[PDB]
Amino acid sequence: DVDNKFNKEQQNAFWEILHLPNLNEEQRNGFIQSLKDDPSQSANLLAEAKKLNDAQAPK
Numbered sequence: 001d002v003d004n005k006f007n008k009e010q011q012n013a014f015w016e017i018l019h020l021p022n023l024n025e026e027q028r029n030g031f032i033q034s035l036k037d038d039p040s041q042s043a044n045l046l047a048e049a050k051k052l053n054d055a056q057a058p059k
Contacts (some may be wrong), residue, residue: 002049003039005054008040009043010039011037012046013043013045013049015041016050016054017031017032017049020049020052020053022053022056022057022058023052023053023056027052031048031049033044
């Protein structure tokens with residue numbers, strides 16, 4: 001399910017997903033599902049989100 005307790009650093013990652021202006025809301029969900037599989041690896045996930053933004057290249 002969902003862990004009532006969270007790490008403050010983890011919260012930072014959640015906001016970055018929201019920031020991605022280039023990406024629509026559905027893409028953001030994809031990161032969340034990954035987070036559930038490996039909460040310890042959320043840091044690893046943090047690096048991946050920035051990379052995806054480049055690919056959309058709305059400009």
